[PDB]
From Swiss-Prot, chain A:
It comes from the Eukaryota. Component of the ribosome, a large ribonucleoprotein complex responsible for the synthesis of proteins in the cell. The small ribosomal subunit (SSU) binds messenger RNAs (mRNAs) and translates the encoded message by selecting cognate aminoacyl-transfer RNA (tRNA) molecules. The large subunit (LSU) contains the ribosomal catalytic site termed the peptidyl transferase center (PTC), which catalyzes the formation of peptide bonds, thereby polymerizing the amino acids delivered by tRNAs into a polypeptide chain. Belongs to the eukaryotic ribosomal protein eS30 family. Component of the small ribosomal subunit. Mature ribosomes consist of a small (40S) and a large (60S) subunit. The 40S subunit contains about 32 different proteins and 1 molecule of RNA (18S). The 60S subunit contains 45 different proteins and 3 molecules of RNA (25S, 5.8S and 5S). One of its GO terms (cellular component) is cytosolic small ribosomal subunit. This is Small ribosomal subunit protein eS30. Its main location: cytoplasm. The keyword Ribonucleoprotein applies. GO terms for biological process: translation. Keywords: Cytoplasm, Ribonucleoprotein, Ribosomal protein.
UniProtKB/Swiss-Prot annotation, chain B:
PROSITE patterns: RIBOSOMAL_S24E. This is Small ribosomal subunit protein eS24. HAMAP family: Ribosomal_eS24. Residues 100-132 are annotated as: Disordered. The gene is RPS24. GO terms for molecular function: structural constituent of ribosome. It comes from Candida albicans (strain SC5314 / ATCC MYA-2876) (Yeast).
Swiss-Prot record, chain C:
This is Small ribosomal subunit protein uS12. One of its GO terms (cellular component) is ribosome. It is found in: Cytoplasm. It comes from Candida albicans (strain SC5314 / ATCC MYA-2876). GO terms for molecular function: structural constituent of ribosome. Component of the small ribosomal subunit. Mature ribosomes consist of a small (40S) and a large (60S) subunit. The 40S subunit contains about 32 different proteins and 1 molecule of RNA (18S). The 60S subunit contains 45 different proteins and 3 molecules of RNA (25S, 5.8S and 5S). PANTHER family: 30S RIBOSOMAL PROTEIN S12 FAMILY MEMBER. Component of the ribosome, a large ribonucleoprotein complex responsible for the synthesis of proteins in the cell. The small ribosomal subunit (SSU) binds messenger RNAs (mRNAs) and translates the encoded message by selecting cognate aminoacyl-transfer RNA (tRNA) molecules. The large subunit (LSU) contains the ribosomal catalytic site termed the peptidyl transferase center (PTC), which catalyzes the formation of peptide bonds, thereby polymerizing the amino acids delivered by tRNAs into a polypeptide chain. Keywords: Cytoplasm, Ribonucleoprotein, Ribosomal protein.
Swiss-Prot record, chain E:
One of its GO terms (cellular component) is cytosolic small ribosomal subunit. Gene3D superfamilies: 2.30.30.30, 2.40.50.740, RNA-binding S4 domain. Residues 177-210 form the KOW domain. It comes from Candida albicans (strain SC5314 / ATCC MYA-2876). The keyword Protein transport does not apply. Residues 41-104 form the S4 RNA-binding domain. This is Small ribosomal subunit protein eS4. Pfam families: 40S_S4_C, KOW, Ribosomal_S4e, RS4NT, S4. Belongs to the eukaryotic ribosomal protein eS4 family. Keywords: Cytoplasm, Ribonucleoprotein, Ribosomal protein, RNA-binding, rRNA-binding. It is found in: Cytoplasm.
Amino acid sequence: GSLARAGKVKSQTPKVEKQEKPKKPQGRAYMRLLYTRRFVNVTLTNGKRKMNPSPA
Amino acid sequence: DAVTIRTRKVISNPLLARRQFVIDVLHPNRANVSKDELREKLAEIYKAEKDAVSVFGFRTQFGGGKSTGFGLIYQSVADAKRFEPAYRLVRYGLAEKVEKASRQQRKQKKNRDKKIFGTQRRAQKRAARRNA
Amino acid sequence: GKGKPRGLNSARKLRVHRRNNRWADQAYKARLLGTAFKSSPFGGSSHAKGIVLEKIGIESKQPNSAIRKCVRVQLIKNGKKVTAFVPNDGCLNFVDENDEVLLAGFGRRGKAKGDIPGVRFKVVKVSGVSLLALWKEKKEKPR
Amino acid sequence: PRAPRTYSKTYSVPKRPYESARLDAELKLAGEYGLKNKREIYRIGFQLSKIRRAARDLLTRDEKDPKRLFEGNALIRRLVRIGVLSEDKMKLDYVLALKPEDFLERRLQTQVFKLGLARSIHHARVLITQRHIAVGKQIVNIPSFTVRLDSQKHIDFAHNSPYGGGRAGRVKRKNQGK
Amino acid sequence: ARGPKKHLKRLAAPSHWMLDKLSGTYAPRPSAGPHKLRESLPLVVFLRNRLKYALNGREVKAIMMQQHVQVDGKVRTDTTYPAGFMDVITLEATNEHFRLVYDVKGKFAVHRISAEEAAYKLGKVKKVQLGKKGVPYVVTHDGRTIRYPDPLIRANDTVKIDLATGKIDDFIKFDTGRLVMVTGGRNLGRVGVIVHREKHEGGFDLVHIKDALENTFVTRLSNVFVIGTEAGKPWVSLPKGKGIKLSISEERDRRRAQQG
RNA sequence: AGGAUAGUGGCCUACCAUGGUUUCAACGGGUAACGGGGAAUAAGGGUUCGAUUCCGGAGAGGGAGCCUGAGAAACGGCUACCACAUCCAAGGAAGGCAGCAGGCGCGCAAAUUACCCAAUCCCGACACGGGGAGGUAGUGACAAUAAAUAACGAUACAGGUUGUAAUUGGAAUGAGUACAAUGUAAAUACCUUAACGAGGAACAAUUGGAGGGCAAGUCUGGUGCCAGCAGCCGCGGUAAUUCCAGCUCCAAAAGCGUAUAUUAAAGUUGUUGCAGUUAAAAAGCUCGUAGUUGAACCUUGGGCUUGGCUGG
Ligand SMILES: [Mg+2]
Ligand SMILES: [Mg+2]
Ligand SMILES: [Mg+2]
Ligand SMILES: [Mg+2]
Ligand SMILES: [Mg+2]
Ligand SMILES: [Mg+2]
Ligand SMILES: [Mg+2]
Ligand SMILES: [Mg+2]
Ligand SMILES: [Mg+2]
Ligand SMILES: [Mg+2]
Ligand SMILES: [Mg+2]
Ligand SMILES: [Mg+2]
Ligand SMILES: [Mg+2]
Ligand SMILES: [Mg+2]
Ligand SMILES: [Mg+2]
Ligand SMILES: [Mg+2]
Ligand SMILES: [Mg+2]
Ligand SMILES: [Mg+2]
Ligand SMILES: [Mg+2]
Ligand SMILES: [Mg+2]
Ligand SMILES: [Mg+2]
Ligand SMILES: [Mg+2]
Ligand SMILES: [Mg+2]
Ligand SMILES: [Mg+2]
Ligand SMILES: [Mg+2]
Ligand SMILES: [Mg+2]
Ligand SMILES: [Mg+2]
Ligand SMILES: [Mg+2]
Ligand SMILES: [Mg+2]
Ligand SMILES: [Mg+2]
Ligand SMILES: [Mg+2]
Ligand SMILES: [Mg+2]
Ligand SMILES: [Mg+2]
Ligand SMILES: [Mg+2]
Ligand SMILES: [Mg+2]
Ligand SMILES: [Mg+2]
């Protein structure tokens, strides 16, 4: 087979810079962040619990 | 600031003409106590000559405020100079650090002399005759 | 009586029978015959370096349709020639003829992986630089 | 050469990496006790798993066996000493009934928070790590320090700490000194 | 391989010396001497690890080179001299006399004795036979050769050595009811009386010994050392514990009461 | 019977017999084989590994032969040959890193041509000398231990007396740097500790993933059976939950992924503990030696006295 198309899609993928965002806490602080986010201020949708709800 | 010295596990050792013990130093509000200052304090406590007192192996506990080491008190300065290691006497100023070449040079000189049989004077005299 | 001896003095028969029948286990058979030592291109090693002979595109098996971009590599340690897949989008451009590449298996332990036919190795490094580092522009190829 | 120095691992990872029931239980348990990571939970489970194994082996022996009486009493005594086992449960059958929360109760971090020296469990760990807490007259900066029963009453601020009668810290001296 | 070994690795040293693993690579190799390597205690271990008079191996050599240490009434300057069972160590500078007797835990106790008792020692008769010119002699457990012994003395008996003239004061015949210390095996250090000697021609004779607490144990005859003429009458002072083995539970109970 | 040996012995010689081992596997072959203490994994039983900190053996490029000595068939001793290889004025002479460090080569694969006898011990005529044995430091993400990367208030809001989501404060601290002392043979580092050392506390945590197995998107853009992903099942042919990216999220975290081997999973090696009508597998059928395995039967019952330990 022809080798001319190697890297075709990655080359033509439009470059998008990563948006600058505040650092997330590390170590014990991050476990604290996850714990509250999942067991203190519960965001369940009346028995519907989603980690990454897509916008809909 | 109010340095307190405690001695425990004291053993009288006339075999080496000394008394030996563990030293506990309480030095609150103080990084630690220098060996020179402990020898001065120990000499006053036990009314011995400063040069007959040897301390070593000190370590400060975690959190500070206390150190533990080992101490020796000899019956005389002469006894200390006889039984103390050389490196400790250099620490206390009772001896001069012996000056010798580095270990590499001493070994290399030793191996060069292994190639000569007899006196060095004869060997160099013979070499001069050969080259003249 | 289950077809095997049960007598208290039949340990020899039981021991010999198990020894004869472990040869039906290919994992045991390959270990004692030393097939990796004799037959494997790597000679039993996890990795092996080699020189790139040519860049070759290999058609994937059905039902997939693609050109799997591999290389022909001659191993330094024994002179054997193998085909090694060069992973990721566009990493074939990092690999040139007469380069020194470090190879490794696909993780199927001597079998081909996926739809790629007859290829049992992948390129890990080229010219002493990780192919992953080159792909993510962490490093540049020394040339 | 010199004799080798012994060392050993103090934890073990779960066999199944992804399990929502275990993942939620661990995170719930880490959040309550302000643990840094899952390895601090694996460590408790690992050391509790071998306490049970020792107790199980003795429980298979006959009662009044010299080894069961000697090592069983010693194992019970050690657990009672650190407060993990209650004084009315010295039977080697209650040892098997112990749970990981019993051990996490006895950490220095948990005890500092439960003694009122800290606002929260996460405030307790930073107080310990920053050399503010002393057990007896010794500064301890290890959060996992297991507090013994006789050491419980002597947990307090270090005498040379800003919170315990020491001088003002670096920040205050720079502010009031300007 | 080509000749005698001169080193001793720390891990390969006898366990009853109670040496630590990490202090170094080597251990003191005992010299040739009256006692076997495995059943001896070099003076460097005794003066530094036990008494802690010396802080290191350099200092113990300084101690012995000043003529302080005497073993069995003679000055020894060999830091690895193999002192052994029943040997007397004298440090007249400190006015101390020690006897190397096993304690019940299997190690050489630091057993101080009086000067009067330090004037003699006991030796187990290994063999009796005739020397040149037909002179009978006795070989004790510490390699001593005493000529012209009492014609009643036989093997496995214990003789009392004057230790200043090297002669035999008197002896104890090996028989039932004699006081015994065990000098080998896992019953090392225990003290009891002989109950019954069981003979095995061509093999090893076994001795049945009853403790003061009426505990009975069996050991090989080669590990039996007669130390007294009857129960409660030893010819030397016994170390603390009197060679009575306590179970680990009993020791734990005893330590609790001793410390409160 | 002798010889030889330190000594036993076909160890060797002379003479004489014809013996010795073997399906209970001799003999031969292979070993990517030094043996063991041990290591990994393991409900139990097991499977795999053990060049390598201790013990025993063997070797010093390959053989062989020796001197000295108590002890060597020694190689940092010698002699010879073979193979390598150095200087040479061409006549000759000198070699042995599987010691320490270091170099080349080989390779997937492994550190300083450093300091010291202070410790551990060893050697010597020896209290004193020597020791790349050993110790110290350097390199070192082999493995192992502990353990930072933030904590707490006030407003503002949402919220059900307090958990957060933001913009506002003053505290705390060690990473780092350093007087100094300690440490050490001398240092380094650790431990202590003046002065300095945190708001984007830029003193900025990574590695892999987000269809299922398997925890976490049916979000947005790009490509269009291409590029690629994908351990396996599969995804990709114009709204791709799987490719390339952004966002968000998940897992473990100073660690995480990949390759290979191995162990569990594997009751897929099964003694415990498999299967053999049809999925693989009862020899076509009998005989038969070794092997394995082999019916039942021979002092039982009764009586008296007594010691101890469990419950009371
Ligand atoms: Mg000379
Ligand atoms: Mg077949
Ligand atoms: Mg398929
Ligand atoms: Mg041997
Ligand atoms: Mg000697
Ligand atoms: Mg015999
Ligand atoms: Mg003969
Ligand atoms: Mg013959
Ligand atoms: Mg012949
Ligand atoms: Mg092996
Ligand atoms: Mg080999
Ligand atoms: Mg080995
Ligand atoms: Mg090899
Ligand atoms: Mg070895
Ligand atoms: Mg070589
Ligand atoms: Mg050679
Ligand atoms: Mg040789
Ligand atoms: Mg050499
Ligand atoms: Mg040699
Ligand atoms: Mg060299
Ligand atoms: Mg690490
Ligand atoms: Mg950081
Ligand atoms: Mg990421
Ligand atoms: Mg991906
Ligand atoms: Mg994606
Ligand atoms: Mg899921
Ligand atoms: Mg993957
Ligand atoms: Mg299918
Ligand atoms: Mg599209
Ligand atoms: Mg799309
Ligand atoms: Mg398996
Ligand atoms: Mg099956
Ligand atoms: Mg069929
Ligand atoms: Mg079939
Ligand atoms: Mg049939
Ligand atoms: Mg029968």
